[PDB]
Design a protein around this ligand. Sequence first.
Ligand SMILES: C=C(C)[C@H]1CN[C@H](C(=O)O)[C@H]1CC(=O)O
Ligand SMILES: C=C(C)[C@H]1CN[C@H](C(=O)O)[C@H]1CC(=O)O
Ligand SMILES: C=C(C)[C@H]1CN[C@H](C(=O)O)[C@H]1CC(=O)O
Lengths: 83, 257, 76, 31, 51
Amino acid sequence: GGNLDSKGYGIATPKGSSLGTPVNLAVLKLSEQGVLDKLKNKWWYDKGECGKTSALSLSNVAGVFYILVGGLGLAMLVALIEF
Amino acid sequence: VGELVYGKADIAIAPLTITLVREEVIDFSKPFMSLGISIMIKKPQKSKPGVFSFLDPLAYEIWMAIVFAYILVSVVLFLSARIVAGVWWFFTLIIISSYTANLATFLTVERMVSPIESAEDLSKQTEIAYGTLDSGSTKEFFRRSKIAVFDKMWTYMRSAEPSVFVRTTAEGVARVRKSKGKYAYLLESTMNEYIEQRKPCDTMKVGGNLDSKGYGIATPKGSSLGTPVNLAVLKLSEQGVLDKLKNKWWYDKGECG
Amino acid sequence: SARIVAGVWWFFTLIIISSYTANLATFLTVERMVSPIESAEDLSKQTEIAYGTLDSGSTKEFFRRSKIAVFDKMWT
Amino acid sequence: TSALSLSNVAGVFYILVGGLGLAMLVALIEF
Amino acid sequence: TFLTVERMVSPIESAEDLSKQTEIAYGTLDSGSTKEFFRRSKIAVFDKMWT
Ligand SMILES: C=C(C)[C@H]1CN[C@H](C(=O)O)[C@H]1CC(=O)O
Ligand SMILES: C=C(C)[C@H]1CN[C@H](C(=O)O)[C@H]1CC(=O)O
Ligand SMILES: C=C(C)[C@H]1CN[C@H](C(=O)O)[C@H]1CC(=O)O
């Protein structure tokens, strides 16, 4: 399913620090340059180990086998009502 | 932005995209809405079946020829017959086999073809022209971009003739609708979803977003309004007000929604 | 009279079995997987599958402070 | 995309006509 | 379907595809012009490959 709410992480700095505005501008720059994206793909997806089919199914024919056996059952029924 | 810098307005509330260049001159509140540059095209027509699609795999010539062949076999039998029935059997065998196969190829061709997935595919093909607004955050994004795909796309867009750029959103969308799917419009995800939820509903968004950014409320640098507005945006975000508002304007009253 | 009936019917069933045969190959296998829970709304409505969050943090506080129906129920 | 080829099948049509020709031949030598 | 599997083409049709998949490992010589080409290269695909 989807996400319950939409929010985000962030770099935290003490109120009134000289580092705050530089840090923010840095994050913006990294965001627009795609640094954050490439980093995410690096750690999450790129090395991701989890990652059409020509193969046989016994299951698809099973239903028709059921209608076959049912048909033969009806056949036995008719054979009985006749005799 | 100009009104904010030169003090003609105390605050700016609008789908204003947060960019570094704008963050240098003004102050942005925490984003109240999330978006991204996305691709809008014309959705393909579902079906136009006719009865002609059944006569498609086998040629009209083959139908006429098999009819005359049929009547020829009948008039031959009218005048030994074992090789006739045999040859006819082989004939209709080859034909029904051929029909079955060609029809199979039709059915492959139908579902197999994928028109567009991601922006990279747009960059790799010249068949479908594509463009953005005459101005705004998206165009500037493509322009300043050093990223391979976006660089290529920008080069094409600027160099392409006639101009692929449009003045307004409605113009771009109208261009998407009129072009029979030969034109793609690059616009922020929000607007795309909104237009996608509005009649005639002939347009759709394909693939993910090219980038991830957000809108925000802007206030003059050193304004007293900045921190209260920000804490307010946070309050609304946590309270779910923003979510309910988007559902209100975008989805809930959606005609095709 | 019945000969052309047999003929037309044979042609009909011929075209149909041919079409079915052709489409089945293309259809192949969907390999689709069933999902017990489609969305968060469904989760609130069933007691069969228990669910939880961390002992503390933003998620727990979200559920605690939530005035939204579904999330409220889930929290309770 | 449909070749719907009349040419490939044309040959089988030819062997059909040939078979019916031989058939007419046999029908003639019979009577 | 099986005979279309035989008819299936392009396991790897380009250098880019190697960059796009982690299943098949790939490499160059311990030294020489190729490795240095990949090291010094600033163009996207080959860069990724070098990384
Ligand atoms: C709709 C317009 C013209 C605005 C809205 N956001 C972008 C902005 O903040 O400039 C512009 C669109 C864009 O560039 O994708
Ligand atoms: C992993 C932990 C304990 C942290 C990380 N982010 C959330 C936070 O910032 O509160 C917490 C998880 C959570 O609340 O479910
Ligand atoms: C065969 C070797 C080691 C030499 C030949 N040319 C390259 C060179 O001129 O260094 C080297 C191969 C390579 O770098 O792939």
